[PDB]
């Protein structure tokens, strides 16, 4: 009936043969495999002339598996789009060997149903690059039709490694997958996401793996290039080739470099543990040293937090079980896993807010007890002299700091677009509290009927959510928000003229100029999130009001003391550092995960903490400093009779 040509073929040679409906070509390949060196093989097939009617069918038959594909290989698109690839390459799947040395045979089948003759080239090339080694970078080319996977074996004494792959050009989109060594290997667009840890990639992709997951002490690093870039977030093709005719691709190639490096040891966990406690417990012993010197000488939070916890549990469990690392916007280069937490470093860094808020609450309680005891002594200075001492708002600030730490840690177990508000929101409220804490301090009577906290929180939370949800700037909602910032600056000027002096006038004048300068950034439209900017503008406005109050106090003749000045300088320095690290942070939740991975950076401090972690440490130190400045700013006034002159 049909003539079949069973021919013996050497390994590394390009075989150009003709096949039609009558002919079937059989290739027999014999190779020697060894347990010590794995060395997987790669089958390359190219169809020189395109057969529109019937594709050429290739079958690769091994001892324990069969891989079959059709060339030209037609792949799916997002909207009924077919992409045609005339070169297909696949690495053959090699099962583990029981003996020491084998002589294994695998047969390649070539056949077609098209009556006309079609020519092809078939070359099976041995891969000496199959095994990956620690600290060695391999650059290779892969295409949607040619997927490449490599094997890494765990060196003795290594319990976890990170698989980082970098590309010079963002596109085409790709999916790096880490799979156990149990054959077959899922290196196709349809089954790549079936098992293992996978994440889309444009320029960077880092996956941490551990020996406990893989009993065989080895894994496969499978890289599959997506046909379309929409998942990576780049662009959506809308033209290509119309209707049934498949688009011709294959000119799109992705060049990558896999580097498998040993993950940080348990020493970094201990050193990070000690650094976190050591810095903030230094403040604890410092204030006890400060206290001992003096003695010898003389609901909204809970409502905010519950959905946070629910989202935490569900999302972290989903990421752990499914392996879809695209869900959480971690810093995969610096994310360090402990138990079920993929990013322990961020949560650990969030301990600064908690500890410093607790310490500030203790300081407030001590001051309140001392003031109450002084009142019990019926001292005239405590009763009727100095700025009215109100500790409850200070308690609110301390509780706000502690709960900001809690909420930000709960957010940072899995930073994700569905949680961006949870980090930045309490920070603006604490700033919004430090805002008008001074105003209440100088004008306690105005605070009697203030009714401002709920309004401020509602305003900021409304502003910081729907604008992001609806869009990222429709050329430009963020320019509209810059106009809103301008009218807010006008409202600040309106508050100014309601408040008297030429120096005050000019001070708020360059305050408005500073706000507009910031509004320019709010132009070239807020590339990041308002969430970050609201905190930034709020903190900048808070520092401006700080300076306003200080210049007021110096102008009125009230002299700032040594402790307020030292706290002021420390707060400024630390605020500046915090701002620098806050500014360095960019992207994250707003961008797509593949585009978000591009900005990821390695660890900076102690091989454990990233830039954001440093921001958490610094912010808490700065905010503690701000609270302390507020606590001690009017100390000079307290030691003297209440001012006869009307309040500023």
Ligand X SMILES: *[C@@H]1O[C@H](CO)[C@@H](O[C@@H]2O[C@H](CO)[C@@H](O)[C@H](O)[C@H]2NC(C)=O)[C@H](O)[C@H]1NC(C)=O
> Under the rule (CB under 8 A), what is the footprint of its own copies?
1-2, 4, 6, 8, 28, 54-55, 57-59, 61-70, 76, 80, 105, 107, 109, 111, 113, 180, 182, 186, 188-191, 193-195, 215, 299-300, 302-304, 306-311, 313-314, 417-418, 421-422, 454, 457-458, 461-462, 465-466, 469
**Binding marks (x or -) toward Zn ion, 371..410, rule CB under 5 A?**
-------------------------------------x--
Name the residue nearer to ligand NAG (CB basis): 25 or 174: 25
Number of residues in contact with Zn ion under rule CB under 5 A: 3
Contact between 128 and ligand X by CB under 6 A: the answer reads no
Question: Would you give the binding string for ligand X spanning residues 224-263, x where CB under 6 A is met?
Answer: -----------------------------x-x--------
State the Cα–Cα distance between residues 635 and 588, nearest whole angstrom. Answer: 43
| Residues pairing with 149 in the sheet | 222
Instruction: State the binding partner of 30 from its own copies, Zn ion, ligand X, none, CB within 5 to 8 A by kind.
Output: ligand X
Work out how close the CB of 76 gets to its own copies at its nearest, in angstroms, rounded to a whole number: 7
Minimum gap (Å) between residue 267 Cβ and its own copies = 31
Residue 27, H or E segment: strand 23-34
Tell me how far apart the alpha carbons of residues 267 and 271 are, in angstroms, rounded to a whole number: 6
Nearer to its own copies among residue 186 and residue 344 (C-beta)? 186
Among 8, 156, 243, 445, binds ligand X (CB under 6 A): 8
Q: How far is CA 308 from the centre of its chain?
A: 17
Picked from its own copies, ligand X, Zn ion, none, the partner binding residue 423 (CB below 5 to 8 A depending on kind) is Zn ion
Smallest distance from Zn ion to CB 391, Å: 29
Taking CA 487 as the corner, what is the angle to CA 483 and CA 492, rounded to the nearest 5 degrees? 140
Count of other CB atoms within 10 angstroms of residue 182:
14
- Nearest approach, Cβ of 66 to its own copies (angstroms)? 5
Which residue, 49, 103, 101, 92, is CA-closest to 71?
49
Query: Under the phi-then-psi rule, with left for phi > 0, alpha for psi from -120 to 50, and beta for the rest, what region is 526?
Result: left
CA atoms within 13 A on the CB side of 204: 16
- Which residue minimizes CB distance to ligand NAG? 3
In the range 94-123, which residues lie near ligand X by CB under 6 A? 103
Which one, 117 or 572, has the nearer CB to ligand NAG? Answer: 117
Q: Is 143 exposed, middle or buried (0-12, 13-18, 19+ CB in 10 A)?
A: buried
d(Cα 78, Cα 189) in Å, to the nearest integer?
Answer: 13
d(CA 341, CA 412): 10
Binding of ligand X by 15 (CB under 6 A)? no
Residue whose CB is less far from its own copies, 57 or 387: 57
What backbone phi and psi angles, to 5 degrees, belong to 30?
A: -115, 125
Q: What DSSP letter does each residue of 455-498 carry, written as one string?
A: HHHHHHHHHHHHHHHH-S-SS-HHHHHHHHHHHHHHHHHHHHHH
Closer CB to its own copies, 149 or 608, in the complex: 149
CA distance 174 to 231: 9
The least CB distance from residue 119 to ligand NAG, in Å, is: 14
Those residues with Cβ within 8 angstroms of residue 1's Cβ, 6 or more apart along the chain or in another chain? none
Q: What is the binding site for ligand X (CB under 6 A)? A: 8, 10, 30, 103, 139-141, 253, 255
Interface residues toward Zn ion, by CB under 5 A: 408, 423, 612
């Amino acid at each position: 009936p049909k003539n079949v040509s069973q021919k013996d073929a050497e390994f590394e040679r390009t075989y150009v043969d003709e096949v039609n409906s009558e002919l079937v070509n059989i290739y027999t390949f014999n190779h020697t495999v060894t347990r010590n060196r794995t060395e997987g093989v790669r089958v390359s097939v190219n169809v020189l002339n395109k057969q529109k009617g019937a594709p050429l069918l290739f079958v690769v038959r091994q001892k324990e598996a069969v891989v079959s594909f059709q060339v030209p290989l037609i792949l799916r698109g997002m909207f009924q789009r077919k992409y045609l690839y005339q070169k297909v390459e696949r690495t053959l799947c090699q099962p583990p060997t029981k003996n020491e040395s084998e002589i294994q045979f695998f047969y390649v089948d070539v056949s077609t149903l098209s009556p006309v003759n079609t020519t092809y080239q078939l070359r099976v090339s041995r891969m000496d690059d199959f095994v990956l080694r620690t600290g060695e970078q391999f650059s290779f080319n892969t295409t949607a039709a040619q997927p490449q996977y490599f094997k890494y074996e765990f060196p003795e004494g290594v319990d976890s490694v990170i698989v980082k792959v970098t590309s010079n050009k963002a596109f085409p989109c790709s999916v790096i997958s880490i799979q156990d060594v149990l054959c077959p290997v899922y290196d196709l667009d349809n089954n790549v996401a079936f098992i293992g840890m996978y994440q889309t990639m444009t320029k960077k992709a880092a996956i941490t793996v551990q020996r406990k997951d893989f009993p065989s002490n080895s894994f496969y690093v499978v890289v599959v290039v997506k046909t379309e870039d929409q998942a990576c977030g780049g662009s959506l093709p809308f033209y290509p080739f119309a209707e049934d005719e498949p688009v011709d691709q294959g000119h799109r190639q992705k060049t990558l470099s896999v580097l498998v490096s040993q993950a940080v040891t348990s020493e970094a966990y201990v050193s990070g543990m000690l650094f976190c406690l050591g810095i903030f417990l230094s403040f604890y012993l410092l204030t006890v040293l400060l206290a001992c010197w003096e003695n010898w000488r003389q609901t909204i939070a809970v409502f905010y937090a519950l959905p946070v916890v629910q989202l935490v549990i569900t999302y972290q469990t989903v990421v752990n079980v499914t392996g879809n690392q695209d869900i959480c916007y971690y810093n995969f280069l610096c994310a360090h896993p402990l138990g079920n937490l993929s990013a322990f470093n961020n949560i650990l860094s969030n301990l600064g807010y908690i500890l410093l808020g607790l310490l500030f609450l203790l300081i407030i309680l001590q001051r309140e007890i001392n003031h109450n005891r002084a009142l019990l002594r019926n001292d005239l200075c405590a009763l009727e002299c100095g700025i009215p001492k109100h500790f409850g708002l200070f308690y609110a600030m301390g509780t706000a700091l502690m709960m900001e730490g809690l909420l930000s840690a709960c957010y940072h177990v899995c930073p994700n677009y569905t949680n961006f508000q949870f980090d930045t929101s309490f920070m603006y409220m604490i700033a919004g509290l430090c805002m008008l804490k001074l105003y209440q301090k100088r004008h306690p009577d105005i605070n009697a009927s203030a009714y401002s906290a709920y309004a401020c929180l509602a305003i900021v939370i409304f502003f910081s959510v729907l604008g992001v949800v609806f869009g990222k700037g429709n050329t430009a909602f963020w320019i509209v928000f810059s106009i809103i910032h301008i009218i807010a600056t006008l409202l600040l000027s309106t508050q100014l003229y309601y408040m008297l002096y030429v120096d005050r006038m000019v001070l708020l004048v360059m305050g408005n100029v500073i706000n507009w300068s910031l509004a320019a950034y709010g132009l070239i439209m807020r590339p990041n999130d308002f969430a970050s900017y609201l905190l930034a503008i709020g903190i900048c406005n808070l520092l401006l009001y700080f300076a306003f109050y200080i210049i007021m106090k110096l102008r009125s003749g009230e002299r700032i003391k040594l402790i307020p000045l030292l706290c002021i300088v420390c707060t400024s320095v630390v605020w500046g550092f915090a701002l620098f690290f806050f500014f360095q942070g960019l992207s994250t939740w707003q961008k797509t995960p593949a585009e978000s991975r591009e900005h990821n950076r390695d660890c900076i401090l102690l091989d454990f903490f990233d830039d954001h972690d440093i921001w958490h440490f610094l912010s808490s130190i700065a905010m503690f400093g701000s609270f302390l400045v507020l606590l001690t700013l009017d100390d000079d006034l307290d030691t003297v009779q209440r001012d006869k002159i009307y309040v500023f």
